[PDB]
Amino acid sequence: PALTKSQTDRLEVLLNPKDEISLNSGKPFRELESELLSRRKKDLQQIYAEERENYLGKLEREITRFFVDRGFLEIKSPILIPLEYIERMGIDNLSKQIFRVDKNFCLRPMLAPNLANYLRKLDRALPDPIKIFEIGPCYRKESDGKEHLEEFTMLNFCQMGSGCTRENLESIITDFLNHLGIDFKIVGDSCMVFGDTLDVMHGDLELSSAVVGPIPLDREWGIDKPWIGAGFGLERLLKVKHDFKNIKRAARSGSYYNGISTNL
Amino acid sequence: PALTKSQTDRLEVLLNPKDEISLNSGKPFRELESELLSRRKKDLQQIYAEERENYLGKLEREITRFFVDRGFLEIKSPILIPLEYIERMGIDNLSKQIFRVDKNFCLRPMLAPNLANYLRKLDRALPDPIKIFEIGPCYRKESDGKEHLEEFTMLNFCQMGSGCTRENLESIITDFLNHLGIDFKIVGDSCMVFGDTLDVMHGDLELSSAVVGPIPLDREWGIDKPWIGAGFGLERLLKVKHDFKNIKRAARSGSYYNGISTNL
Numbered sequence: 058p059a060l061t062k063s064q065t066d067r068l069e070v071l072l073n074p075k076d077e078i079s080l081n082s083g084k085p086f087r088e089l090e091s092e093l094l095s096r097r098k099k100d101l102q103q104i105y106a107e108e109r110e111n112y113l114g115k116l117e118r119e120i121t122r123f124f125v126d127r128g129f130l131e132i133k134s135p136i137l138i139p140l141e142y143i144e145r146m147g148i149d150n151l152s153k154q155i156f157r158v159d160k161n162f163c164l165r166p167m168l169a170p171n172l173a174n175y176l177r178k179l180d181r182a183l184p185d186p187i188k189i190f191e192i193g194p195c196y197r198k199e200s201d202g203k204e205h206l207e208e209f210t211m212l213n214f215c216q217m218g219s220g221c222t223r224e225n226l227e228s229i230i231t232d233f234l235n236h237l238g239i240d241f242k243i244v245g246d247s248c249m250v251f252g253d254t255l256d257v258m259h260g261d262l263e264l265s266s267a268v269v270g271p272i273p274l275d276r277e278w279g280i281d282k283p284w285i286g287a288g289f290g291l292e293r294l295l296k297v298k299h300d301f302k303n304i305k306r307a308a309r310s311g312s313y314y315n316g317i318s319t320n321l
Numbered sequence: 322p323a324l325t326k327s328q329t330d331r332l333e334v335l336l337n338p339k340d341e342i343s344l345n346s347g348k349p350f351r352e353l354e355s356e357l358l359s360r361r362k363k364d365l366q367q368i369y370a371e372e373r374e375n376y377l378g379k380l381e382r383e384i385t386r387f388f389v390d391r392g393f394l395e396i397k398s399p400i401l402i403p404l405e406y407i408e409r410m411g412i413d414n415l416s417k418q419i420f421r422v423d424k425n426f427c428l429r430p431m432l433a434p435n436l437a438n439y440l441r442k443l444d445r446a447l448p449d450p451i452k453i454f455e456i457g458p459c460y461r462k463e464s465d466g467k468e469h470l471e472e473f474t475m476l477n478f479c480q481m482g483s484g485c486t487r488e489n490l491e492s493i494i495t496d497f498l499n500h501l502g503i504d505f506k507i508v509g510d511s512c513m514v515f516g517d518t519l520d521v522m523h524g525d526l527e528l529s530s531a532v533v534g535p536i537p538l539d540r541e542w543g544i545d546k547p548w549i550g551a552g553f554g555l556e557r558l559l560k561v562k563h564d565f566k567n568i569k570r571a572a573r574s575g576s577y578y579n580g581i582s583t584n585l
């Protein structure tokens with residue numbers, strides 16, 4: 058009773074992290090499949106009877122309450138953005154990761170350009186310091202794998218004016234991940250766009266890159282004050298919280314609901 | 322003291338529906354502009370001090386609670402979808418409204434295809450009737466104007482199995498718009514994709530098209546039961562609630578926050 062690769066793939070789709078079932082136990086495929094189908098139908102029936110909230114939707118709402126309560130303004134900006142923003146962030150023709158739309162547009166690969174525009178504009182009207190955040194879809198063409206999606210969901214929070222120090226940035230990151238119950242460490246890294254970053258790690262998984270400005274790119278966006286900011290992937294936070302093996306369990310998907318296969 | 326078209330446009334950007342200020346009162350542009358800038362800075366400072374929630378985000382959360390409480394499952398499905406879904410919904414090469422991405426993808430112009438897939442899949446696992454809904458971004462290339470956006474936000478709720486009658490569909494639409502406090506009437510219309518529709522009107526503004534199945538298109542999506550469904554534009558609901566003259570006030574935007582100009 059050896060399982061084919063097709064049979065193992067079907068069982069892995071139906072397996073969830075809390076199961077203490079092994080696919081190599083010697084039981085035939087028909088019994089492993091029947092048992093896992095029964096467990097997952099039960100799981101989906103319980104969600105329909107008692108919860109009915111989507112994991113990505115529910116986490117966005119929880120994060121939104123956290124930042125609104127700490128004084129950050131909730132932003133919802135365009136997902137379809139000018140291709141020119143890509144040139145101005147300095148992603149010089151990484152640029153291969155961009156989804157193009159028609160002649161002059163693209164799907165945004167990050168939230169920073171739209172939020173830079175909001176920091177600049179709101180500094181003319183609001184008292185110091187300016188505190189804002191956005192949650193929503195972002196897009197990158199990626200090598201397939203366990204920690205990257207082509208369509209994912211970003212949180213970016215940022216602050217401009219007073220209080221924009223490394224120690225305050227680390228304190229907000231720490232209060233945020235303590236609220237979610239997720240352990241982490243900070244390591245130094247760097248990238249083209251922003252220079253040196255403080256990367257927020259859970260083991261070898263990058264949850265966030267964060268930046269303490271000013272940086273030379275600021276003049277291109279009309280930013281002329283100290284600032285701090287961090288970008289987090291929500292599907293990666295869900296992967297840690299629910300111990301998913303593959304980040305697809307967490308994604309916008311017709312193939313999983315709250316980590317449960319929809320092929321039942 | 323006559324105002325140029327550029328000056329009137331600047332004042333219209335700064336004017337809000339609750340103002341009882343006229344741009345033709347004879348006052349010079351410099352005084353009308355200073356007064357409206359002061360009002361809008363005050364308005365934005367009050368939002369930052371006391372609310373901090375985005376109108377599109379807040380309405381999505383309110384609608385989500387309404388449908389979850391009435392027994393509908395919250396869905397979050399892909400925004401970037403196969404171009405093939407467009408052919409299969411019968412949008413035969415209206416097809417000019419589609420944003421293409423690379424060779425084989427597009428931005429979704431509606432939520433129905435992804436929700437048809439979820440109805441089919443969930444009918445294998447959940448008790449009758451199947452009740453689901455989604456809220457999120459949709460995309461159509463449009464003639465510019467006061468009631469159409471290229472990037473907008475759709476609610477679609479639907480049900481399959483028992484209870485899928487014209488009278489139950491009208492009763493859910495009625496309970497939903499009574500919850501939001503919006504008056505409406507129902508008129509018959511039709512379209513290519515679905516055939517006859519029940520259009521939900523507020524005056525001459527179309528809030529929704531709704532459908533009582535079965536329809537011949539069902540076989541293409543593997544749907545084989547009675548069903549009912551309705552699609553609503555959130556920016557149009559916000560336009561009615563806040564008496565906006567132009568639907569851009571309601572949109573994802575770097576140019577307005579909760580209907581207030583960000584150019585201050």
Ligand SMILES: Nc1ncnc2c1ncn2[C@@H]1O[C@H](COP(=O)(O)OP(=O)(O)OP(=O)(O)O)[C@@H](O)[C@H]1O
Nearest residue numbers: 197199204205206209263264265266288289290293
């Ligand atoms: N393709 C993707 N899929 C899912 N989440 C992603 C993806 N790209 C970035 N993120 C998330 O967005 C955050 C901010 O983006 P950033 O540009 O720092 O990513 P990155 O450094 O390119 O990530 P990686 O090094 O893993 O490719 C990341 O820390 C990660 O949580």
Ligand SMILES: Nc1ncnc2c1ncn2[C@@H]1O[C@H](COP(=O)(O)OP(=O)(O)OP(=O)(O)O)[C@@H](O)[C@H]1O
Nearest residue numbers: 461463468469470473527528529530552553554557
């Ligand atoms: N371009 C758009 N901008 C904003 N809302 C829209 C747009 N297109 C459709 N909607 C909203 O989505 C709902 C469901 O879509 P439907 O296909 O019935 O629109 P429609 O009949 O093409 O609208 P219209 O006749 O105004 O173009 C509409 O009733 C409307 O509330």
Ligand SMILES: N[C@@H](CCCCNC(=O)O[C@@H]1/C=C/CCCCC1)C(=O)O
Nearest residue numbers: 167169172173215266275280286287288
């Ligand atoms: N690298 C991380 C985000 C880093 C934080 C960005 N925060 C922010 O929105 O404000 C920036 C303001 C500075 C002016 C230059 C342009 C950037 C906008 C990511 O891609 O998720």
Ligand SMILES: N[C@@H](CCCCNC(=O)O[C@@H]1/C=C/CCCCC1)C(=O)O
Nearest residue numbers: 431433436437479530539544550551552
């Ligand atoms: N015309 C409106 C929506 C009408 C309701 C659709 N409801 C739904 O999601 O389920 C449909 C199930 C039937 C099988 C055929 C494919 C359609 C999916 C709009 O574009 O907003």
Ligand SMILES: [K+]
Nearest residue numbers: 073074075076
């Ligand atoms: K397991």
Ligand SMILES: [K+]
Nearest residue numbers: 208308309399
């Ligand atoms: K996806």
Ligand SMILES: [K+]
Nearest residue numbers: 337338339340
């Ligand atoms: K007015």
Ligand SMILES: [K+]
Nearest residue numbers: 135472572573
């Ligand atoms: K928009």
Ligand SMILES: [Mg+2]
Nearest residue numbers: 154197199205
């Ligand atoms: Mg990367």
Ligand SMILES: [Mg+2]
Nearest residue numbers: 246256263266
């Ligand atoms: Mg990295």
Ligand SMILES: [Mg+2]
Nearest residue numbers: 256263265266
């Ligand atoms: Mg990074």
Ligand SMILES: [Mg+2]
Nearest residue numbers: 418461463469
């Ligand atoms: Mg139309």
Ligand SMILES: [Mg+2]
Nearest residue numbers: 510520527530
């Ligand atoms: Mg119409």
Ligand SMILES: [Mg+2]
Nearest residue numbers: 520527529530
């Ligand atoms: Mg219609």
